[PDB]
């Protein structure tokens, strides 16, 4: 369970340098519940 600014920080651990996508919510799936790396993988740009 990751919430707040650190929730964004973990994203920097995942994407690293791939950026973010250009175009319910992330909070309801990662902050309100339990999510893994696979769940939030695609959030970074390919």
């Amino acid at each position: 369970t990751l919430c707040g600014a650190e929730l964004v920080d973990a994203l920097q651990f995942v994407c690293g340098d791939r950026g973010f996508y250009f175009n319910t919510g992330i909070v309801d799936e990662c902050c309100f519940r339990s999510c893994d790396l696979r769940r939030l993988e695609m959030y970074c740009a390919p």
Partner: protein
Amino acid sequence: TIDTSAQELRGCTVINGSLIINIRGAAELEANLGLIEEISGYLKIRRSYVSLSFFRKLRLIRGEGNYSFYALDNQNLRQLWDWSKHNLTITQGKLFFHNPKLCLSEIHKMEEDIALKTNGDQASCENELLKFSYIRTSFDKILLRWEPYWPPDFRDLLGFMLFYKEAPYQNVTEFWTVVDIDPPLRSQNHPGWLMRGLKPWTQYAIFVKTLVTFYGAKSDIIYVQTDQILKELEESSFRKTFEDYLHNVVFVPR
């Protein structure tokens, strides 16, 4: 029935009349309404705008729709009799509870037609505990520390409330000098607090509880020896909702 009536009794051990007391707004009533042991009649609890500590012992209630324990709506009834040494032997009578701040523990420990949803609408009693660690005492001030409790939502906890009061004897009830401590930063330094000058060689009772939004934990009472919130809650909820909306808008899944 006071807002006097119970003052004329004072030294009475047997009560042959019903109780229709309506005291509303503990130490002041302890001197007079503090020598009651046996009650033979009907007991009714009216509006009490903190705790029912008037009956110190209440060893036996004779009693005699056959209701002996009636509790109406209250605005300041948060706790009840201390369920560690007090004993109740009510034989003839029934149970009827209205008490919105009455926590569920006072109902579950009763075994030592009543509505469940209405009772305990806002039960502000914590279930977990925080054991004290790194206890150091000095001649003038005492520094205390406790383990950090992190809810699933770290923004829910608004800080810590610390209670302290002089108590020469080891019998303290929550029923003050509350001090607010800001929440720490997530990382791991253990939270703690240093107090100001205190009377030397005086026993002190200390316990700390946490405040969270719509959970939490409170520490047990420990003994040591020397040698307007609605607006803030609304602002915190608004900030949390804004942060959640920003995170949802910025972060989009594939």
